[model samples]
Every structure is written in structure tokens, then in C-alpha cells.
Target: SPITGLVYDQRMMLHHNMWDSHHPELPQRISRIFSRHEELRLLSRCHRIPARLATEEELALCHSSKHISIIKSSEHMKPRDLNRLGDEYNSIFISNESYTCALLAAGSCFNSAQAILTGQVRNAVAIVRPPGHHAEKDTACGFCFFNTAALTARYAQSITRESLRVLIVDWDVHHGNGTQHIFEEDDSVLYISLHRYEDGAFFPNSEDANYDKVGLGKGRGYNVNIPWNGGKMGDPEYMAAFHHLVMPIAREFAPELVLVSAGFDAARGDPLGGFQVTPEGYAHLTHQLMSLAAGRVLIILEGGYNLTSISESMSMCTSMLLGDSPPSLDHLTPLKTSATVSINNVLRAHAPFWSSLRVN
Candidate 1:
């Protein structure tokens, strides 16, 4: 009955800013989060796990050889060359230390997952950065590189002699297209994403982020996308999603490990996200996940902007993982009619696959 394991490394803070110092994905992100934890005494509440660089083999579990070498190439490039490389992606920036920080991020996530697998801790949280959900097998976008959470899921599946039914829940405000693409064909890892998809109007604008993308071939029903139409989505919408979709499928699947791509961008007042999900909302979600996988859950950092919002929201999730009672969200009202419509569409879309889904 040990508490959560926390993984963080100062080396990850080195990956910051292409040139504009005002980048939303700033170095201050992790520091603010850790300071908040220390401020609340949350740091000393668990087993502290040291961070490390992921070996090339562990990284290859989710990324390609070319992609790995290309990122490594940036290690010594001058600013002109680095900026030229950044031009290739829709949105990304790279500096000399970016490669090392990326490796550290992935390795930290891998270790966080490892802690859960080895019984070092019942649950864990890796507070490293360069948000991972948007990093594809061969590309880095949305301020992410190396698909840290995806690589960790793959590692969990591989390190075990017998395969594992790993459930990856991406609750970032944007779709984790990379994670979905990596596991869309494999039934062993179930990838579920909840994001603001304005009928394919949001960032990383892709039609595949909609509700009906269950998965391809043998992975049918394994990928769940609960999309939100653009608006101020908040606590009540989350309540509906968990009640109608998330918890139902989670219970039925009975996953061996739960890895949450917990991005605070969905929190209230995020400049980029514009979603209103508050601190209490994240805490309740963490509580729900803790009830699954025999309390084996690993929360990994992903995309987020707005320092105040991210720091407060993440602290709540960490508190919930510490077995603290989540601050009551009873004061919030129920879902918008729009929220129900989307949830209904998801239930119908996956109805053929999951026995747990029912149109209500």
C-alpha cells in the first residue's frame, strides 16, 4: 500500500525556447509544478524516483531509427541550422540540449511505469516535460518529442514476458495523434483520448480525432476519442464522460496498467486550450483512475500553457494520487446539451465493440 512515486529531472529544463523567450512551453513549467508540490509538502509524500536517459533500444520501441538519429543530429547544430530543422514541423523548436532533454523525459516516464510494474510503488507520476502526446513515430509537433508516454506503454508491453493490456488515457486539450497512430493497430494497448476537436478545427487539425475512430483491424474498439466541440468545457462535461464512457470501458477492459497522458492545458484559463476544466475536475479524474488497475496508475506530463492554471491543476491531481479526498466538485452544474450529444455519438459509434456501452 505504498503511495505514488514521483520522477523529475532538472536536465529536462534545458530544452526550452527556439529563439523567442516567450514560448508557451517554457522551462518554468516543471519548476512551478515542483514548487507547488513542495509548497504543499506533496514532494515528501512519496517515494522519489531519480530520472535517467532512455537507452536507444527503449526509444526505438515507439520511434523510428531515422527519427532518432535526426533528433540526435541537433545536438551540435548552430542556431541557423537548428531553426532550419524546426521549420520542417508544423510547430516545434530545437536547441542543442533538446535531444538530451527529450531522452531524459522519455526515460523518466519509462521509469515511472517501471516502478508500478516492479511494485516499487502502487502508482507513480513523472513530472518531466517536452510534452509527449503529440510526438509521432517520425515527427515532433506541438512542443513534443519522442512520444514519452507511448514509449513507456510499449516498454510495459515488451519488458513483461507475457503481454500486458495497457490503457493509455490522453486527457490533454488536444488530440494525442502520435499515441493513437502508434497503437491503433495493436489490441494490447488501448488508447483513449479526450480533446477539443471542433469538427477538425483545432490545432493538429485532423479529421481522425473524432469519436468513431475506435481503431483499425484487430484493435477495433481499442481507440476511444471523446471529442468536445469548441466552447468552455468544464467539470460537468468530465463527469458525464467518465459516467457514460470512460469508467464503463475501463471497468470492462480491466487493464493491467493505466497510463494517463495528463496534460493541464485542459484546465481553466489555458491561453492555448481555452477549456475551463478546473483543478477539482482533474482530481476527480485521478481518483477514478486510481480505483482501476489495482491502483496501478502512472500520470505523465503532456502539453499545457498558462502557468497558474497548469500548476494548480497538476497539484490537485498529485494530491488525489496521495490518497487525499479530492476537493468536492458538487457545486458545479451538469453537462451542456452539446456535451450529451457528443457522448451519445461516442456510445453509438463504439456500441458494436464494447458490451459496456449503451445508448441512454
Candidate 2:
């Protein structure tokens, strides 16, 4: 059973609305991944799953009806009107097929998670478009319309009779504000993100990205934000956070399912993130998460604009998902004080809730 499911569809290319605009989030973003996968012969190792169009009920899991209706209505708007809507909303564009493509994008992630739950695949990767970390319940921002990862978390929970704890790890360089907010009050799903936050000056800038804003009510201490002070937060910094903050807490949580908002925007040379994480860095990160939940992990593509960086980084992840050992990383020293101090602050914040952190 060497079936590693991949969610990709040609129809996704139909929603090319930013044709006239110089946006980084475009169809080629995915096309490059495909080309690289083919070049590396990784496609042959996958079980290709067609991107199904998600039903309105499924989208309702994480989006509001009014917001859904707004996206649906854009299907009939003229090209100029659609572009105007894009201008109104940050990093969003609409085409006649935007609704359909968006639905398929969300559905792709949903299906990938379902495949893992059903034992159809050991691991799965949903290579979808219209990156969905900044998307919220009511607004379409950050080139995203639906919170796909959040919806997948909900969808996975609904299909099981027993209560399942889910862990969402977002490494997209920008914080997953939407996913954090959606599950902020629920303790069942733990959301952890490592993003560039120059004191809350990043895109979708909000206090939610702060580590102090743990979860609310029953969800307190479940939400984890590892914000990098600035760029150049490389391998040593990330590995230290995982070893100190992410891995310890995640192992204690013991999620039944793990969903990664698998954004490679933090990869070295990415135009958007400007971070210095290399491809091997991503591989190692994925490898560490594999130690949890018996490797029941689903990666849904989020941000990552640089084609070469995304392609190379995802190839490493896909290889890890296929049970291949990660390439050896170069020798690295300890992280700087900026990262270590941030990790300590996160540990201290959660120490009151997670015994794992309190003892450490």
C-alpha cells in the first residue's frame, strides 16, 4: 500500500482572475509544484485524487452563510466588477469560476484528511490554491476565501463516533489567524503556528498572532503562536522551537489527527516571507511532526510563492510522507537569544495548563 494521496485538479487553473494583476498567488504556483513532482518522478508514487467541489454544507463548517453568499455572488459579476471586488478585499480576485475553484480547493483538503482517516493513505498532501490561512469566517483576505484547514478539522471530527483531538500546525510564515480564531474556544483542536511577526507588523496583522493570546475559555493554553521577531529565522531557531515548545506540548496533546497548514512561504528566497528556511529545514520539520499521532498527518498547501522554493520544499515533505528518511541537515549551532527568549515566553504562558511545559 504505497498510496500517498495527492489532491490536484486541472479545473483549479480555471480560476485565474488575477490575470491583469501582478499577484504572486496565481495558477502557476501549483503548476510549478506539479512540474517539479514530475521532474522528480514523485507523481508516480502518489495516488492522484481529483479535487472534488465541496458542498455548501461543508463550507459552512468554518465560514458564514453571508460570507459564502458573497463569494458565490461574485460568479456572475463582470470581470471589471470582479477585479474591483479584489481591490476592495486584500489579496483577493474573482472570476466566473472563482466560486467553483475555491470550493474545489477547500474540498481537496477535506478529501485528503478523509483519506487518512479511512486508511486509504498513510499520509496525504492537498496541493490546493487560493491559500487559506488568513481567510476568516466573514472576510476573504490574504488571497484566501475559505478556511480550508479549519473546515477539514471540523469535517474529520464529524465523521468519527469517538471524540478525536486534532492538532493543526501552521508554518506559513504568516500566522493562521482564521484557524486560530475558529478553534480558539474549542479545546479539542490544538493550533500551533510559527510565523514572522515583527511585533505584529505582518500581513493580517492582529493581536491574535501574539503568544499571550492563548485560547479563550475552554480552549486556553491550546493555541500556540511561535512568532519570529524578524526574518533570517533559520534552521537552528525552528528546530529549537520544535524541541522546546512544539514537540513537547504536541506529544502531551496526543492528537488523533494532525493537519498542517503546509505553507512554504518561510522557505529560503521566498518573495513574500523573506525568511531563510531551506528545503531540508522543511523536511526536518515535517519529520519531527511525524513522531506524533502515529504519523496520521495531512498537509494542505497554504502560502509559498517562490516556485523553486515551494517545489523543492514540498518534494522533501512528500518524501518524508512516503516514509523516506530526511536528508541530513548541516551542523547548526544554538539559536539566538531573540528566538530562545520567545520560546521560553511561550513555554511559560502554557506552563499553567500543560504539565509537559510546567515540568520542563
Candidate 3:
């Protein structure tokens, strides 16, 4: 019941059921189970955020006109239309309703960001699907419809010009390639990600060297990556990396705001994750990040397919972010393999660029 503060949207209005496969089509349902299991069902009131479709201007801030038009007119397109969109935007599925759902998802993100900035709440989670991390400035790849996290960053940053440096920490099993691309050329947002790539053969390919690839101009040194070898990391390995790499950088940055691209698909049993992260692993992970962030944090749901993995991992993160000390991890185990080689590579690669960093 202490976790009632965690907000959710249970309506199946924002995503195509076709998007639901292997994983439960309805992530909100899984999250509701988490709410009940965490005793939040009786305590927290589930309020539907009065979010509507985002305007064209708002959506254009992060996407291209051609792409947006394509998504809008997707309903009437014949097989030819689907083929063209697929050719241009790999892995993108656009039904008549997808455009509306995408706009709704973007609005939900705006509402969540507004809640935090207006002091209506300390932190909140927007349980939107049609995951947005993989959508880039001009293209749509992966399953993302729009860049919700990026849009939220833009909205939050608009509140002040005092150089609002927000740090985005992503630990999704898949690389947030789109997010990185969105902010890579901009310094106002620091994008950091730790994903699992197997021998550079994965989708988007960009393995080891690809991780630390900096921006083209002033945005250099702002984009950070600490990719691991496959999903070889368990809790201890992730904890060590966070302590040594992520936490230290965060402490030094002393960001005024911290936003999480919280994707629980990294849980041990996830088909896409292929890692050994337990629910308690997620708890400890959030615990450390929230501690450094000084309780100013917002977690936006990104990706997590498995029902059990999504439910328990989200509960753990919600509890941790709410300042509750989660129960100990009973499933903790040694990492199958050390990412020492890759970690070392990242350090050396980033050293010259981040020489001014005081992350001790």
C-alpha cells in the first residue's frame, strides 16, 4: 500500500494488439498485477491522465514531416503503402489507429513531466506502450512510435534556460540507439546507456566501438555508452559497473533532474534480455540511482515483454524510487561472464574525451 504513488493507465487505447506477442499484449494489465501485489491497489487511486493527442507542432519537434504524414495516412494505404513504409522505416507497423495511439502516448509523457514540474507530485510513472525509445529524429525503427523521453526532456527543459542538464540512464537489454541519435548532437541532454550486444551482430549493429561514439560537434562527451558483452551481467556485475562508472559520473554531473528510461525487459527471464537480473537486482539498481538523484526522478516505461518479469521488476523499481528499501534479492548470483574486456575498452575510449570529469 505504501507504493500507491506509482501511477498507471490500464486502458487498452494506445497500442495495437498485434504489437502484443510472446509478451502479454497488455503491459498495463501486468503492471496492475504488480500494483496489487505491492499492495498499491488499495492505497493508490488509479487516475487516468487527461492526455489527448499531441499537436502537430509538438510531434514535429522530435519527428520528421514526411514520416509523420506517412503514419497519419497509414490507414488507407494498400499493401503498396505498407511496403513503402516498411522499406523506409524498418520494423514499423502503422495501422489506422497507430497514429492516434502514438499521439496519446506522447501526451501522456507530457502530462507526467508536467506533474513533476508543477510540484503536483514528486515522481510518477507513465505506463505507455508502443515503446518510444527507438524512434529517431527522421525515422521510426524498432517498435517505437515517437520519442517520448526526448519529448519530455524538451518540455522540461523549456521551463528554464539556466542550462537544465538532464541525465537519461537506460539499462534496457537493447541499445537505445534512437535516443542516442536524438541527443547525440545536443549537449543539453546527457544520454547514457548500457545494453547487451552479442558480437556486433545484433540489430543496429554498433557494438563496442559503437557504444562510445560521440557527437559530431559541441555535443561531444555528452553521449555515453557502456555496453556489455551479450547479457553476461548479473546483479553484482551491474552493481559494480554502476558504482564504478554510472554512479560516479552522475554524482559529478549533479544533474538538476534525472529521468529514467526504465525498461524491465532486462530481467533474467526475458526473451530479449537474456540476462540474469532478478527483481531485487532492479530494486538495488533504482536504489542507487535515486539516492544520487536526490529523490528527483521520473521513470518512463520503455520496454519489458514478459508478464512476470515486467510485474516484479516494476514493483521493485517503484519501491526503490519511492525511498523504500526493497527486500533482499534471493536470486542473486555471479555473472556468467565478466565484461571486463568491454568495460576496459569503454573506459579507455572515454578517458581522453572525459578528462575533465571528476567522477571519483
Candidate 4:
């Protein structure tokens, strides 16, 4: 059996919004997930990795100095200034603890990757928040101050002696457009995102979130987006992407390490993600992804509201990471035909790049 590593810290809860008590990205999000892990008894059997702050140099891997300065400057700002600064970015709150929590969040992920890559753990999950993936190099958005998965990918390549091929799997309901853009010009990291595009009507409504926008320049073909079309999607639709596109492409990429932007907003009943992914659905994905990179998979938490849904989803994923077999989904409906067009579009677009791609 493989040893799973857990990367989480209580300090991360300090990054709460000063302005809105009812904010969707609540401080309780991380705390609640941790509680479920305890209740489910998942933590007792694992390697608990301590969290650390990511130094500015390490952060510079994917963030600009000025942007770093801006985040750092937040620590000294009064509530009024912090609120004013937070207003500058979409859904971002610049509290004093936000910068510290952001660094810990990023570094926690980096440590998980390092731990797995070094064979200390077969897999790990960093349940940190101020959920990243939306933070770009030069700007922060969507409550994200730093790109945890992106920085971890770049940091992994730098620290290892070998030329590392990293495959980032973003299953968050929203497009991690920042994560895509960070590695879009470099093929060293293969970025795959499955998000609700709603024809770019979704949050972070960039045209680049579509299936057609593969990576650019040398990075071309390395970026894969399975933009969801039509109504609330669920298990079958997600598994369809995994079975058809994500899995095949990942197999061909032969990543030295796999990083997941594991957001549970898509889990059933999430207010933000109006999708139907269940806890079991997340576990199946986690189990299958464990088959890759010699089981060196690192899942970093991203977005999810509706605490119950995210907690249940996270617990199931951690169970799989811990080498427990995923429970079978007792009830499964056929994947909606609405998802078919988007799935086909991704296959067709990426077929030119991946030899393993099964074009419809």
C-alpha cells in the first residue's frame, strides 16, 4: 500500500474576508475540510506534511516582482486600505493574513510535490485556501493570491536534476485561466482544464477557455481544455472527459509528476458550481489518476463553496489517495448528449498533438 501525504495548516483560515461575513470563500472552508478528514479517520493513516511560506524567489517562478510586491504590501495595509486594494481585483480580499496564507498555500503544495517526486509519499493532497489557480503571474483574481499548482510545477522542474514533464489536471468547475497562461508558452508542463465554459459565459470568461485554444508557440498542444457546454453536468460527463481525453493525453505525456487543481465546487449542490459531481465521482477520478506517474500525484485544493459538498468530495478524494478503493457509484445516469459536442471538440483539437488521442 502507498503512503499518502496531507498538507494543510490551521493558519490558512486567517485569510478571511474582512468585508463580507457571508462571503462564499469562507475561512471555515479549509477548517471544515480538515474536520471531515478527522471525522472520517483519514489523517491517522497518513504522513502529515507541515506547511511553509514560499519565498519571494520561489514565487517569482510564476509571479512578477511587482505583483509580489503588491501582495506583500497587503500585510501592512489597514482594513480600509486592504478593502480598497481588494476592490481592485475581482473577488479578491487583501487582508493582512491573505499574503501569509497565500504563501503557505503555495508552499504547502510545493512541499507535497517535492515529497511525492522524491518518493517520500506516493501521493499527497494540500487542502489549503485562498484557493489558487485563478492567480496569474502579474495579478490576483477570484480570491486567489498566488498560483499554487503553477509555482509547484515550475519549482519541481527547477529542484529536480532531471528534465521534468509535469501534467497539471484542473477539475475545478471554473477555468484556471491563469494556470493555463502561465504554462501556455512552455511544453515542460502539460495543462489540462475541465471547466464550465458555457460558451465563455462562465466566470473568468476568457475566449482562451475554449477547446480550440491549445498552447501557443513551443507550448502548443500542451494545453488542453474540456469546456463544459449546456446544463449542469455530473459524474458521467466528467468520467467521459477522463476516459476519452484527459486519461489518454496524460498517458502519452508520461509525466514525471501529476498535479491536480482539485476543486469540489462541481460536487452536487454547490451554489457556485451548479453541476452534479458527487463524492464518489471525485474518488473515481482520484483512483484512476493514481495510476499515472508511478502514483506520484499531488492534489492541491482550489475552488468550492457549499462546505458540505466540498468536504464530502475532499474526504472521498483523500480516501482514494490513501490507496483505499473507491466505492462504486450506486446510481449513474448516462452522460448527457449536451456534453458530447464539447468532448468531441477537445478530442479534435488535441488530436493533432497527442498520438494517443481518440478522435471522435
Report the lDDT tens digits of candidate 4 across residue range 51-135: 9999999999999999999999999999999988998998787789999999999889888888887888999989999988999
Over 4 Å off in model 3, which ranges?
1-7, 11-14, 17-50, 75-88, 207-209, 327-337, 353-360
Better of 2 and 3 by TM-score: 2
Runs with alpha carbons beyond 4 Å of true place in candidate 1: 330-332
How many Å off is the CA of 38 in candidate 1? Answer: 0.2
Residue 221 CA displacement from its true place in model 2, Å: 0.9
Writing each residue's lDDT as its tens digit, candidate 1 over 101-209 gives 9999988888888888999889988888888888999988888888998999988877774369898989999999999999998888888899999899998799889
lDDT, candidate 4, equals 0.90
RMSD of 4: 1.4
- RMSD in Å for all candidates: 1.2, 1.6, 3.6, 1.4
Residue 198: error of model 1 in Å?
0.6
Better of 1 and 2 by lDDT: 1
Residues 237-334, candidate 3, lDDT per residue (tens digit)?
A: 77766765677667766776677888877788777677777888888877777665446677777777777777777766766655576656432444
TM-scores of all candidate predictions against the true structure: 0.98, 0.96, 0.86, 0.97
The clash count for each model shown is 0, 0, 0, 0
Query: What global local distance difference test value does model 2 have?
Result: 0.85
TM-score of 1: 0.98
What TM-score should be assigned to candidate 3? 0.86
Q: For model 3, where is the 10-residue window of minimal lDDT?
A: 1-10
TM for candidate 4 is 0.97
- Who is ahead in lDDT, 2 or 4? 4
Q: Candidate 3, residue 294: CA error in Å?
A: 3.5
Error of 1 at 69 (Å): 0.4
